Amino acid sequence: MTTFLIKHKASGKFLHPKGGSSNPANDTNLVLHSDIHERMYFQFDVVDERWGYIKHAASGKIVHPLGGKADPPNETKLVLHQDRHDRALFAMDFFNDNIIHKAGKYVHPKGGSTNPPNETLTVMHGDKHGAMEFIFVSPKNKDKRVLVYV
């Protein structure tokens, strides 16, 4: 029941539903944006050990690779959708600072910039570098890491 911000480590921007709606439509893209508000709070619903759903707190929709592929290819866009099923399972790796999908690819800003412009889309991608790192922080203190698994 921890509520948290998903902060892009290299830039300090955050994960947002595009347009910042408190009830985004199914398949709304997830983007990076520098602002902080209640419509970009997230929660994490643990389903199976490390695996769980990344839940948009304001709407209850969860993060999906678009099209619900179990093994999405590189550049598959990330979106919000009400559906709850095991092709939307991620782990929040707070030791290596990344978000990893069940099939092994990572959440990236599209293009992998260390300082992506606001509204950059997010995609799945297998590579690791400094610009796909994320930390999970308190909505009350964007520099304080919080535990997403409790």
From Swiss-Prot:
Temperature dependence: Optimum hemagglutination activity between 37 and 40 degrees Celsius. Retains its hemagglutination activity up to 60 degrees Celsius, but loses the activity at higher temperatures. This protein is stable at high temperatures over 80 degrees Celsius. The thermal stability is increased by the presence of ligand D-galactose.
Coiled coil location: none
Domain of life according to the entry: Eukaryota
Residues reported in the UniProt entry to bind D-galactose 3: E75, H108, G111, D127, K128, H129
pH dependence: Optimum hemagglutination activity at pH 7.4. Retains its hemagglutination activity throughout pH range 3-10. This protein is most stable at pH 7.4.
Listed name of the protein: Galactose-binding lectin
Subunit structure: Homodimer. Likely to form large oligomers; oligomerization enhances hemagglutination activity.
Function: D-galactose-binding lectin. Also binds N-acetyl-D-galactosamine. Has hemagglutination activity towards all types of human erythrocytes (O, A and B) and rabbit erythrocytes. Agglutinates Gram-negative and Gram-positive bacteria including E.coli DH5-alpha and L.plantarum ATCC8014, respectively, and has bacteriostatic activity against them. Also agglutinates M.lysodeikticus. May be involved in innate immunity by recognizing and eliminating pathogens.
Key words of the record: Glycoprotein, Hemagglutinin, Lectin
Signal peptide stretch: none
